[PDB]
């Protein structure tokens, strides 16, 4: 229900572009935590990362909210290599 975590990605070979399409009906979201599937994480809203190995990555990101509650959506990615 609240907040709604949610996200868009932009693949160009190994490197992502996000955008942020994350809501809140009740409060206001005030931090996130990115984890790209790989071993790193980001705090940023709508980060920029990139990959090493051609493959699948999971991306998942969690949002909080004003009130101290999160929500998570993942969306599984294919980078490749040239
Ligand atoms: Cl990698
Ligand atoms: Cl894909
Ligand atoms: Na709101």
Do not use: C
């Not at 907040?3 to 931090?31: H, Y």
């Not at 984890?35 to 949002?63: C, H, I, M, R």
């Amino acid at each position: 229900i609240a907040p709604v975590a949610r996200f868009e990605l932009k693949v160009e070979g190994l490197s992502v572009m996000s955008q942020n399409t994350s809501s809140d009906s009740d409060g206001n979201i005030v931090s996130y935590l990115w984890d790209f599937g790989n071993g790193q994480t980001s705090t940023e809203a709508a980060p920029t990362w990139s990959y090493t190995k051609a493959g699948s990555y999971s991306v998942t990101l969690t949002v909080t909210d004003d009130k101290g509650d999160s929500d998570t959506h993942q969306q599984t990615i294919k980078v490749d290599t040239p």
